[PDB]
Structures are given as structure tokens and as C-alpha cells.
Amino acid sequence: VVGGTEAQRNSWPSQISLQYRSGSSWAHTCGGTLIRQNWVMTAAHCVDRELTFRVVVGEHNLNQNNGTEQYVGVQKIVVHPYWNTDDVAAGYDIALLRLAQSVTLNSYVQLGVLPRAGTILANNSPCYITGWGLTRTNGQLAQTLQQAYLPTVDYAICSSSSYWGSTVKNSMVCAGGDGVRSGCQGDSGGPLHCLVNGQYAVHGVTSFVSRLGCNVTRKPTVFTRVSAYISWINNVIASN
Ligand SMILES: [Ca+2]
């Protein structure tokens, strides 16, 4: 997250860190949202590589002991069957991970609230992106969880020519684009939390930013629209 601020420890208890094993260590690669004690929602592009992955819940600082983390292996990776890695702009960038163990819920580990199916946010709706992603274009990951205020940009505007044009689909949510704050690599897969009727819900799964860079004016961060995928998510969870 470029232009973010450090999140409070208990603000976003559905945020997870998806990590892969590299030698004898583990490296954060993406975010996700805990949606059941034993399921995580993330981006399909986060699990394109044939890696060994674990999920960390209750994580705050990637480089130091918080006294709150639970570490759990990934038992099953269900990618959306229309996902194509060579075409992020086609959408379907979503995947569900079944965890090898159910995690324990507490202040730091909670299920993410998801929007009702079909819900679309008005233009300029208040949202925060969260993650440990790069803090600058071509920069480095944050040690502590960051958040950035990223108001949505409606589809009519987002899919216009000076924004993302036809690159953006109605199955996506755009947010930010102020040239200062944005998601960035390593935020992928994580939540966009938006305020609706008093309640934050996870309306987005972070998908992509411009090839030009992370915080680019009129290139808002793009997210998979969670409310387009409710039936899909239920169907998976019901049959795995
Ligand atoms: Ca930690």
C-alpha cells in the first residue's frame, strides 16, 4: 500500500497473510480475507505458481512476534474455473483456499463480512485497502499492516477512456486513483473494506494496478467485485 498509514492491531481481523516457503523460510506474497474458520478468499493470480503456501491469521508485523499469530497450511486451492493468467483484465481473479486446520476466532482473527449478492457502491464510497504490499512503486513490503483510504470510482467513470477504458469490467470494483494512495504488489488477494449502513464489508479482492506503477493518477487500484461472486463462493464452500 503506497500512501498508507499503519493499521491498528485489531482493526481488520479478517486480513490474512498468504506466504510461500522459500528455502527454510517463509515469504509474504499476497493478502486474503478469512471467510470461514477454514476458508480464505484471495486472488487467483496469487496461487498461479506451484508453491507451498501457508496462511497466517492474527498477523500484524511480518518480521516480529506479535503474540497473536496462528499459522496454517493450505489443504485445497479452488481457483475460479474461468480464470486465465494471461488475461487479468478478463476478470475471475478469485480463489478460495481450504485451510488444513480451522483457526480460532478472537479480537485478532474474525470472519470477513461479505456484501449481499449484486451490491454496487455509489461513486466515491468510503473504503480502505489493507495489506503488507510495497509502500512505493518498485519499493518494498511493509513490515506492519498498512491501510489507505481509497474511495470507489464507479464503473461508468472507471471504464471511461482517461481511466481504465475497456480494461475494467463490471465484475470489478475500482478505488482511489488520486496518484498518491493505491494498492501495490504484495497487496494482491487482500480486502477492500467499504462502509455501508454502518458496517465495513469486504467488497473487493485486490487484483491489479497500472503497468506504469502503483499510485498513478486516473489508474485506480482494481479489485474483483466480491458481490458478483457470492453464489460461486457459496457453491464452492458447500461442495468442499
Ligand atoms: Ca508477526
* Ion ligand 1, residue ranges at CB < 5 A: 61, 66
Q: What's the domain count of the chain?
A: 2
**Whether residues 23 and 87 fall in one domain:** yes
Query: Sign of torsion, CA 43 186 88 4?
Result: positive
Residues 96, 20 share a domain: yes
| CA 61 / ligand 1 centre spacing (Å) | 4
Range of 59's domain?
13-111+228-240
* Co-location of 92 and 191 in the same domain: no
Q: Which of 45, 60, 80, 193 is catalytic?
A: 45
Type of residue at 142: A
Q: How was this one solved?
A: X-ray
Quick check: 132 and 16 in contact, CB under 8 A? no
Identify the CATH number of the domain in which residue 20 sits.
2.40.10.10
3-state helix/strand/coil string of the chain: CECCEECCCCCCCCEEEEEEEECCEEEEEEEEEEEECCEEEECHHHHCCCCCEEEEECCCECCCCCCCCEEEEEEEEEECCCCCCCCHHHCCCCEEEEECCCCCCECCECCCCCCCCCCCCCCCCCEEEEECCECCCCCCECCECEEEECCEECHHHHCCCCCCHHHCCCCEEEECCCCCCECCCCCCCCEEEEEECCEEEEEEEEEECECCECCECCECEEEEEHHHCHHHHHHHHHHC
50 belongs to an annotated ligand binding site = no
239 with 220, same domain?
no
